[PDB]
Amino acid sequence: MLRFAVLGHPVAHSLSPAMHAFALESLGLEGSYEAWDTPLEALPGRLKEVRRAFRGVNLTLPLKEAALAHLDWVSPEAQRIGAVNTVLQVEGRLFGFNTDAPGFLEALKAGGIPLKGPALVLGAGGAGRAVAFALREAGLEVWVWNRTPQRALALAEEFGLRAVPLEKAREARLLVNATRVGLEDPSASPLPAELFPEEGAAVDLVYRPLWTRFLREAKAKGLKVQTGLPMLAWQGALAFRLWTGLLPDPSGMEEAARRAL
Amino acid sequence: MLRFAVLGHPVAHSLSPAMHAFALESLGLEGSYEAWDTPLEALPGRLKEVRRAFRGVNLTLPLKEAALAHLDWVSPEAQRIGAVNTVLQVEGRLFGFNTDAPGFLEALKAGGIPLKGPALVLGAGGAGRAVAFALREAGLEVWVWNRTPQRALALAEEFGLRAVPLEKAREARLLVNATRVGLASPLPAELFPEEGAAVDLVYRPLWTRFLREAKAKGLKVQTGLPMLAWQGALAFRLWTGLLPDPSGMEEAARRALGV
Numbered sequence: 223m224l225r226f227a228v229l230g231h232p233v234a235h236s237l238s239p240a241m242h243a244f245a246l247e248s249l250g251l252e253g254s255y256e257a258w259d260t261p262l263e264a265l266p267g268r269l270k271e272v273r274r275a276f277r278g279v280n281l282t283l284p285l286k287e288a289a290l291a292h293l294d295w296v297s298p299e300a301q302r303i304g305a306v307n308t309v310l311q312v313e314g315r316l317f318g319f320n321t322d323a324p325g326f327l328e329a330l331k332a333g334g335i336p337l338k339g340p341a342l343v344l345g346a347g348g349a350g351r352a353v354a355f356a357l358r359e360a361g362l363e364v365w366v367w368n369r370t371p372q373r374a375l376a377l378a379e380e381f382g383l384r385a386v387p388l389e390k391a392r393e394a395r396l397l398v399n400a401t402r403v404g405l406e407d408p409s410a411s412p413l414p415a416e417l418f419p420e421e422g423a424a425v426d427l428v429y430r431p432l433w434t435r436f437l438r439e440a441k442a443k444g445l446k447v448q449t450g451l452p453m454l455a456w457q458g459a460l461a462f463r464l465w466t467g468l469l470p471d472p473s474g475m476e477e478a479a480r481r482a483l
Numbered sequence: 484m485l486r487f488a489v490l491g492h493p494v495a496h497s498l499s500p501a502m503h504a505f506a507l508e509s510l511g512l513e514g515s516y517e518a519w520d521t522p523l524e525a526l527p528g529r530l531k532e533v534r535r536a537f538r539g540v541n542l543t544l545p546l547k548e549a550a551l552a553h554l555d556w557v558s559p560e561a562q563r564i565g566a567v568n569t570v571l572q573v574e575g576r577l578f579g580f581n582t583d584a585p586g587f588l589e590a591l592k593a594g595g596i597p598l599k600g601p602a603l604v605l606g607a608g609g610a611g612r613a614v615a616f617a618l619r620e621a622g623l624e625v626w627v628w629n630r631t632p633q634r635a636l637a638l639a640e641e642f643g644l645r646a647v648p649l650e651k652a653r654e655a656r657l658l659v660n661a662t663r664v665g666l667a668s669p670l671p672a673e674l675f676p677e678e679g680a681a682v683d684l685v686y687r688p689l690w691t692r693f694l695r696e697a698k699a700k701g702l703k704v705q706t707g708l709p710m711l712a713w714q715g716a717l718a719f720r721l722w723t724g725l726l727p728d729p730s731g732m733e734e735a736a737r738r739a740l741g742v
């Protein structure tokens with residue numbers, strides 16, 4: 223049967239096991255999807271094991287960027303993004319892909335979020351780079367910001383976007399939190415309330431808590447909002463199709479993650 | 484659903500569609516595996532179609548070598564062999580593999596054919612190259628022969644093996660006939676191995692003089708059907724992560740053949 227896993231640290235709280243358990247039974251397939259705590263230093267040995275006993279694995283912090291160097295092939299998109307969130311194992315070879323980017327666009331459509339810019343992505347790490355890549359592919363005007371400017375500049379220069387100071391958030395029509403600010407901390411938000419735009423939409427990739435301070439601020443501000451679950455479900459469904467050629471129902475996977483938190 | 488196909492010219496006599504229909508059915512999967520005649524000229528265009536509508540395809544004569552130039556990635560083994568018989572499509576990208584080699588070895592293993600050396604491979608084509616590579620990596624002393632001398636010497640040089648005269652077949656303990664281009668052996672009965680095993684890479688035939696001669700000589704024998712089933716089951720797993728029963732696939736083919 224199909225052996226899958228999400229590698230990272232921390233991963234004991236991942237909702238992927240629940241989503242793909244649904245995927246497997248839903249498609250009538252026998253298999254498992256476990257959470258395997260993997261610290262950066264353990265990554266090399268961990269991928270060696272993946273080559274022998276797993277059909278595929280998802281990668282999460284802090285392994286998405288370091289993984290590229292240990293793979294046999296990286297997709298053109300994952301190369302530009304500089305992060306791989308999905309690995310396929312065939313004949314002991316590892317192929318890297320990024321389903322965070324396409325998953326994000328699918329989630330936006332599923333949420334009725336209009337593809338209207340300027341779209342400001344907060345955070346220029348792996349997740350932020352994937353979101354910026356996806357919004358660029360969708361043809362929107364994209365702005366990027368990062369606590370450390372050079373990271374946002376590098377991204378804007380590489381993708382041909384615009385790096386902006388944080389206060390430009392008031393002029394964005396779509397705001398996406400791709401930072402980890404807010405993770406398990408209801409008191410923290412990456413953006414001061416007064417910097418939110420008075421109209422538009424906001425999406426948060428952080429889904430622990432589900433209704434983060436950022437999202438609650440955005441909703442109260444008069445912005446249309448979307449939690450991080452739709453993207454989580456779509457990037458997962460897309461990864462499952464990469465591994466098997468079959469697409470499990472994204473909404474079903476979303477529902478499964480919702481019940482798992 | 485899952486869409487697969489075997490591309491080649493001719494492919495009207497391929498037993499792959501029969502075997503994979505069983506693979507899909509037995510594994511409770513929805514999909515199809517069709518034979519699609521593909522002359523060498525339609526190959527570039529056919530692969531473009533594969534990128535968009537098929538999860539994977541098998542390639543047979545005369546596409547195994549010409550296909551490499553049109554793929555995004557080729558496995559180390561397929562590169563050395565110089566032939567790709569299995570293509571996987573993910574996100575519109577094409578990856579080439581060679582399941583002929585591992586399928587051959589697994590078929591010998593499952594069929595109880597001992598890897599007794601020296602082994603001799605007759606024929607240096609896509610199948611012959613895959614077989615020689617497989618036997619070499621298995622640790623055997625491997626000899627090669629070809630109707631055309633230069634062909635055998637080139638293969639011997641590339642893989643670090645030895646090209647030998649037809650008479651050396653008497654000293655081989657594992658004899659493989661890979662001269663069956665597209666379904667009479669070139670080996671006189673008097674030059675057959677003294678002891679050991681003979682494998683005839685022929686898929687449709689129930690029997691062959693080559694095999695009857697080997698059997699009579701007291702050699703353990705095997706046709707090419709087990710290899711076809713195994714290269715096919717391995718291809719299916721490459722495509723989906725699921726391995727269909729190789730024995731089941733072989734039986735499906737035999738029933739299709741009416742023997």
Ligand SMILES: O=C(O)C1=C[C@@H](O)[C@@H](O)[C@H](O)C1
Nearest residue numbers: 228236237238280281282307
């Ligand atoms: O929480 C999780 O299990 C995941 C989170 C994201 O990094 C995804 O990109 C990853 O595939 C799995």
Ligand SMILES: O=C(O)C1=C[C@@H](O)[C@@H](O)[C@H](O)C1
Nearest residue numbers: 489497498499541542543568
């Ligand atoms: O006849 C067939 O359908 C096949 C023949 C061999 O060349 C195999 O390598 C191919 O994958 C399938």
